[PDB]
Amino acid sequence: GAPPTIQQPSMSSAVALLGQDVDFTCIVNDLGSHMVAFVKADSPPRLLSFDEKVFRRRNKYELKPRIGDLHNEWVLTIKNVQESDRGNYSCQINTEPITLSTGELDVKVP
Amino acid sequence: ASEEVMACLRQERSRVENPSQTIVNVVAENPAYLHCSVPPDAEHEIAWTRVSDGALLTAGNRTFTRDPRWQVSKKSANIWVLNLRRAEQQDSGCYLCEINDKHNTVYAVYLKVLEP
Numbered sequence: 001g002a003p004p005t006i007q008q009p010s011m012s013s014a015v016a017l018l019g020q021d022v023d024f025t026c027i028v029n030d031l032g033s034h035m036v037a038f039v040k041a042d043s044p045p046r047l048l049s050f051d052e053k054v055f056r057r058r059n060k061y062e063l064k065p066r067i068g069d070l071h072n073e074w075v076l077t078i079k080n081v082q083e084s085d086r087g088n089y090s091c092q093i094n095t096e097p098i099t100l101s102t103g104e105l106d107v108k109v110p
Numbered sequence: 111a112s113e114e115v116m117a118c119l120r121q122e123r124s125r126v127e128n129p130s131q132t133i134v135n136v137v138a139e140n141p142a143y144l145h146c147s148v149p150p151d152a153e154h155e156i157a158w159t160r161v162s163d164g165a166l167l168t169a170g171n172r173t174f175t176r177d178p179r180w181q182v183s184k185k186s187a188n189i190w191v192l193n194l195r196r197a198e199q200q201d202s203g204c205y206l207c208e209i210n211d212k213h214n215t216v217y218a219v220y221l222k223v224l225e226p
């Protein structure tokens with residue numbers, strides 16, 4: 001009987017090198033009938049995936065929903081990271097009020 | 111108030127200027143209708159987001175939020191509508207429609223709900 005929670009370690013902040021693939025993991029306990037979205041928290045924020053669907057650029061963003069041992073890990077992959085991919089990424093659960101976890105990506109050029 | 115409206119509308123990111131209303135005033139307890147125009151003769155998906163908290167409201171053909179007052183529908187060939195079935199003062203603020211088109215269009219709409 002608990003509401004959805006985001007479990008450690010989720011949305012870890014990272015420094016990556018240009019061209020790496022970068023994963024953001026959102027581990028959700030007690031998701032129930034709620035749903036998960038990934039967002040780039042720029043201004044304006046950009047939707048990356050909602051539920052089990054990648055919103056755009058399937059060659060740039062990948063989603064692996066409900067994986068891990070407990071089938072509760074949501075993994076967003078950013079392919080081939082560039083300087084434009086720097087910034088904050090969020091995992092959102094559609095509770096009310098929303099439940100969020102955010103991590104920051106830095107990208108260094110050789 | 112001016113700062114708030116401008117900070118909302120400055121978030122538009124488009125190659126084609128928004129052809130719809132981008133400032134909507136309604137009275138609390140009435141419905142609100144926010145419009146998103148998409149490119150014609152193509153099957154684009156859109157998503158509506160509430161900027162105050164970042165809540166995703168609708169995505170593609172379906173409501174995402176569990177707040178039951180929100181629905182998305184197709185008003186005509188190229189116009190989608192975010193329908194708020196009963197507006198309250200606390201719904202005032204900035205809303206974004208993102209389109210999955212090649213230019214990754216974002217349209218911004220400022221909603222003001224006035225006291226009944």
Ligand SMILES: *[C@@H]1O[C@H](CO[C@@H]2O[C@@H](C)[C@@H](O)[C@@H](O)[C@@H]2O)[C@@H](O)[C@H](O)[C@H]1NC(C)=O
Nearest residue numbers: 041042043086087088089090102103104105
């Ligand atoms: C990333 O986030 C840092 C912490 O900021 C807070 O969370 C973000 C997502 C915003 O909602 C912001 O208003 C909050 O203060 C920021 O200090 C940092 O500048 C952000 N980095 C970039 C590139 O935006």
Ligand code: NA
Nearest residue numbers: 011102103104
């Ligand atoms: Na964080």
